[PDB]
Design a protein around this ligand. Structure first.
Ligand SMILES: CC1=CC(=O)CC(C)(C)[C@@]1(O)/C=C/C(C)=C\C(=O)O
Ligand SMILES: [Mg+2]
Ligand SMILES: [Mg+2]
Ligand SMILES: [Mg+2]
Lengths: 306, 165
């Protein structure tokens, strides 16, 4: 247990946020983490080695909770299977650039779950299902962080956010897919869509994000293509924070980091999830409530120090 | 378009915009109308409606308070029944409240008989006039309202077609 998770309906009537925490959810081929020539100096073969990893995910649903739930139930399974296939294929490739392969695995994973939600591919239920999971106006953000001893790999889709706290300073690991972002607006308008400022910048004046799972009623303008970032860990790292807009709309990255560092430190000075990280997640959830957040609030804190 | 000039001609003032959208439904008129006419249950076909509260029986002047699902720029709207003609199959509504930005929104929805693939079908036409909110163009307003109404009609068609074989 290296994490804590806090969640609340908040001032909203229904709960449409979800989150996942799957320890040892898959084994990461070491080729995606080190080079062959780097492991051979030790006498080890990067192709055979496997590094167990954990998965943490935040899914801000909208128009319903079905898509955030489904993401919470499927992304880690699909991603585990994909990392197995990629572990096999990587043994027959020779030294290539791994970043491309992280993008490949995460992009195909998200796109896969999206096609399942959209009824475009048949899925298993142990039996098969092909009808869409839910109505076409239901969708969900999906920010997922794979953690292992060496790397933190992030796949972001939507307006949820993950912030890495390093050396008492904040480092953003995902960039919100707000439809007014230059590249996002340019891509939407190039495809014939329109971004309208209607209580915020929104796609066709409706959805205040440009990428998401589901929402097949706004395709191809809203896409499930994630932004991936491979971040090597450092002994100077403190912790990781995933959360829905219900936290970042009223709290900043700086304050979130300062707060999380303080909380974990205080717990360790004063003494299933991890008690310290859980304390940080509860304190951030209640801080977002105290700052007047009217959305569902979901927060995950991953402790990165041993 | 012969129906548009008879039931859907608006005279939007200069600070307004007006438009329409249509949808072919592969179902009989009486079924589609039986769904639309239920002024107290718009979530029967309207996909963005989470709840709807209306008191008393349905009559001209009835007001319903509608809550919409997340993923939209507003959360509630207050609407009044202005026209409910069962003989000509006409439904007209006006937005009198809400936390949205469609002030003086008026919509006219008509259901006409049609022949789709040599079988009985329905042509649904919904038109509207609305005030352009500050900081937006008439075109922006129309793309917004048209996106929403296109969703509404598509959903209506799926509900209707799912009740006829
Ligand atoms: C879904 C929707 C989005 C808004 O911003 C306004 C409002 C709250 C009125 C709402 O109902 C509007 C619905 C519309 C335009 C037509 C309808 O449903 O007949
Ligand atoms: Mg939400
Ligand atoms: Mg937000
Ligand atoms: Mg939210």
């Amino acid at each position: 247990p290296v994490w804590g998770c806090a969640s609340t309906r908040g001032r909203s009537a229904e709960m449409e946020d979800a989150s996942a925490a799957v320890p040892r959810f898959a084994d990461v081929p070491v080729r995606l983490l080190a080079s062959r020539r780097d492991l051979d100096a030790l006498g080890l073969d990067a192709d055979a080695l496997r590094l167990p990893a954990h998965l943490f995910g935040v899914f801000d649903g909208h128009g319903g909770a079905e898509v955030a739930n489904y993401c919470r139930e499927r992304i880690h399974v699909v991603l585990s299977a994909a990392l197995a296939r990629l572990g096999k294929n990587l043994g027959e490739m020779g030294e290539v650039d791994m970043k491309e392969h992280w993008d490949d695995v995460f992009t195909k994973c998200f796109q896969r779950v999206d096609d399942e939600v959209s009824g475009r591919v048949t899925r298993v239920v142990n039996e098969v299902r092909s009808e869409p999971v839910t109505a076409e106006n239901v969708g969900s953000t999906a920010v997922v962080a794979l953690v292992c001893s060496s790397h933190v790999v992030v796949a972001n889709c939507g307006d949820s956010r993950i912030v890495l706290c390093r050396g008492k300073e904040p480092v953003a690991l995902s960039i919100d897919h707000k439809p007014d972002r230059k590249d996002e607006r340019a891509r939407i308008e190039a495809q014939g869509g329109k971004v309208i400022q209607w209580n915020g910048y929104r796609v066709f004046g409706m959805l205040a994000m440009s990428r998401s799972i589901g929402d097949r009623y706004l395709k191809p303008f809203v896409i499930p293509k994630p932004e991936v970032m491979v971040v090597p860990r450092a002994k100077d790292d403190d912790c990781l924070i995933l959360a829905s807009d219900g936290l970042w709309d009223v709290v900043s990255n700086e304050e979130a980091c300062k707060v999380a560092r303080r909380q974990i430190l205080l717990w360790h000075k004063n003494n299933s999830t991890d008690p310290a990280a859980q304390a940080a997640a509860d304190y951030l959830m209640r801080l977002a409530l105290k700052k007047g957040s009217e959305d569902n609030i979901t927060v995950i804190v991953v402790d990165l120090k041993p | 378009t012969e129906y548009v000039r008879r039931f859907h001609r608006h005279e939007p003032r200069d600070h307004q915009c007006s438009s329409a959208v249509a949808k072919h439904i592969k179902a009989p008129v009486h079924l589609v109308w039986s769904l639309v006419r239920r002024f107290d249950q718009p979530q029967l076909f309207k996909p963005f409606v989470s709840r709807c509260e209306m008191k008393g029986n349905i009559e001209i002047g009835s007001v319903r308070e509608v809550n919409v699902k997340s993923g939209l720029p507003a959360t509630r709207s207050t609407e009044r029944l202005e026209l409910l003609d069962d003989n000509e199959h006409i439904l007209s509504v006006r937005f009198v409240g809400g936390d949205h930005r469609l002030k003086n929104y008026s919509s006219i929805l008509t259901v006409h008989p049609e022949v789709i693939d040599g079988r009985p079908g329905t042509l649904v036409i919904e038109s509207f006039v609305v005030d352009v909110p500050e900081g937006n163009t008439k075109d922006e307003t129309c793309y917004f309202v048209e996106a929403l109404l296109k969703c509404n009609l598509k959903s209506l068609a799926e509900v209707s077609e799912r009740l006829v074989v």
